[PDB]
Structure 1
Amino acid sequence: RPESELIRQSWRVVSRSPLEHGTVLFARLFALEPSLLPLFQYNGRQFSSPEDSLSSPEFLDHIRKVMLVIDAAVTNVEDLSSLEEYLTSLGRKHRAVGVRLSSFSTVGESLLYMLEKSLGPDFTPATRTAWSRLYGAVVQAMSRGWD
Structure 2
Amino acid sequence: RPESELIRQSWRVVSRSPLEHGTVLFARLFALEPSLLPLFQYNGRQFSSPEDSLSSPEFLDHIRKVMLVIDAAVTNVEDLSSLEEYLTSLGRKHRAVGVRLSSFSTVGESLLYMLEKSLGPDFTPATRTAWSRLYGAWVQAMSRGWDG
User: TM-score, normalised to structure 2's length?
Assistant: 0.98
Deviations 1:71-94 (A, max 9, x none): 000000011011000000000000
Shift of 1:104: 1.1
Match of residue 104 from structure 2: 104
The unaligned stretches of length 5 or more in structure 2 are none
The alpha-carbon deviation at position 24 of structure 1 amounts to: 0.1
Deviation of 1:135 after TM superposition, in Å, equals 0.7
Tell me the alpha carbon deviations over residues 79-123 of structure 1, each in whole angstroms, 9 at most, x when there is no partner.
101100000000000000000011011001000000000000000
Deviation at 1:42, TM superposition (A): 0.2
- The alignment yields a C-alpha RMSD, in angstroms, of 0.5
CA distance in 1 between counterparts of 2:89 and 2:145 reads 6
Whole-angstrom distance in 2 between the partners of 1:79 and 1:102: 26
Superposition map of 1:27-106 within 5 A: 27-106=27-106
**C-alpha separation between the residues in 2 aligned to 1:144 and 1:89?**
8
Measured in 2, the distance between the counterparts of 1:30 and 1:83 equals: 27
SS of the residue corresponding to residue 54 of structure 1 reads: helix
**Percent of aligned pairs with the same amino acid:** 99
Structure 2 Cα separation of the partners of residues 44 and 94 of structure 1:
16
Count residues in correspondence.
147
CA distance in 1, matches of 2:68, 2:135: 14
Structure 1-normalised TM-score?
0.99
Give the deviation of 1:2 after TM superposition: 1.8
Unaligned runs of 5+ in 1: none
SS of the counterpart of 1:42? Answer: coil
- Aligned to 2:55, the other structure's residue is in SS state coil
**SS state of the match for residue 81, structure 2?**
helix
Q: Deviations over 1:22-58 (max 9, x none)?
A: 0000000000000000000001100000000011000
